[PDB]
Amino acid sequence: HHWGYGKHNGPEHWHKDFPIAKGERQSPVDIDTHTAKYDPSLKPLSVSYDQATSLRILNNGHAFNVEFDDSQDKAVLKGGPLDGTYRLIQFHFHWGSLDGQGSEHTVDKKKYAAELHLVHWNTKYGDFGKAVQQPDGLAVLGIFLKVGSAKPGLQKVVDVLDSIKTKGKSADFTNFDPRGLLPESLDYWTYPGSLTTPPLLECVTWIVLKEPISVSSEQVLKFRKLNFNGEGEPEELMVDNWRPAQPLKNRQIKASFK
Ligand SMILES: CC1(C)O[C@H]2[C@@H]3OS(=O)(=O)O[C@@H]3CO[C@@]2(COS(N)(=O)=O)O1
Numbered sequence: 001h002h003w004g005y006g007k008h009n010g011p012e013h014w015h016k017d018f019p020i021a022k023g024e025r026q027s028p029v030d031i032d033t034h035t036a037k038y039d040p041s042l043k044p045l046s047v048s049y050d051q052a053t054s055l056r057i058l059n060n061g062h063a064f065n066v067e068f069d070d071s072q073d074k075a076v077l078k079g080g081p082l083d084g085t086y087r088l089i090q091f092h093f094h095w096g097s098l099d100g101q102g103s104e105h106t107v108d109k110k111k112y113a114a115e116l117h118l119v120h121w122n123t124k125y126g127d128f129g130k131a132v133q134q135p136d137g138l139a140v141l142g143i144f145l146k147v148g149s150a151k152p153g154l155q156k157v158v159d160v161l162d163s164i165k166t167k168g169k170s171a172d173f174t175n176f177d178p179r180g181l182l183p184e185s186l187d188y189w190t191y192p193g194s195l196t197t198p199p200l201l202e203c204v205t206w207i208v209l210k211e212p213i214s215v216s217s218e219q220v221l222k223f224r225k226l227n228f229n230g231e232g233e234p235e236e237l238m239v240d241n242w243r244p245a246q247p248l249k250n251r252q253i254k255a256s257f258k
């Protein structure tokens with residue numbers, strides 16, 4: 001029972017066990033749309049998930065992970081500000097107790113109802129564990145969620161949450177296509193940052209899509225029915241598992257669009 005998102009173990013407490021929490025390149029951050037500068041040196045973003053192989057979904061106590069077989073370059077992210085190939089290992093979300101909060105990154109200080117994170121590791125480092133020890137070890141694709149119409153591509157995810165309500169529970173999740181969670185446009189903002197959960201390693205190149213995807217109230221409400229706790233323990237609804245914006249410090253957020 002280490003860190004968490006509560007009053008006594010949340011984000012403001014993390015620095016104690018993880019000093020880097022107060023580092024020079026921490027995530028998330030607020031994205032100032034007026035200050036972000038168009039970067040013409042950015043290469044076209046390339047998301048290739050046609051051969052993605054989903055395997056299982058797991059409730060890890062602070063979020064749920066949809067894992068993918070990454071033993072091969074089946075689903076990768078390249079281009080944009082990245083050099084090399086980054087392999088998709090899993091995707092997860094961060095959400096709130098209410099629609100007005102839940103996203104980790106913010107846009108002009110605006111918080112979205114949730115935020116999808118598709119985690120990829122630089123194949124040049126061999127495995128995920130070694131990549132996190134490198135400044136350019138990971139590339140995380142962030143996609144904001146706003147409440148409106150339902151997202152067809154997300155329902156299969158929503159429907160299985162009933163089977164992994166508590167910590168430690170997992171369920172088979174093969175044959176799920178992550179392309180169903182992407183918005184139409186790939187316009188994005190990018191900057192060098194870190195993991196948003198301990199160990200908060202500063203090994204991430206963040207790519208945050210400007211266009212949010214719409215999900216229905218019914219869909220988000222199901223996310224809020226998950227538990228932080230393990231089976232048979234007092235219920236602690238899994239909500240507000242997001243780290244607030246951190247100081248930008250010596251960084252510049254670049255935009256892929258003019
Ligand atoms: C599941 C979740 C949020 O936990 C985090 C842990 O960071 S870690 O690199 O030590 O390994 C775990 C898996 O990756 C993460 C990455 O989260 S994130 N929010 O930075 O994208 O995803």
Ligand SMILES: [Zn+2]
Pocket residue numbers: 092093094117196
């Ligand atoms: Zn995340």
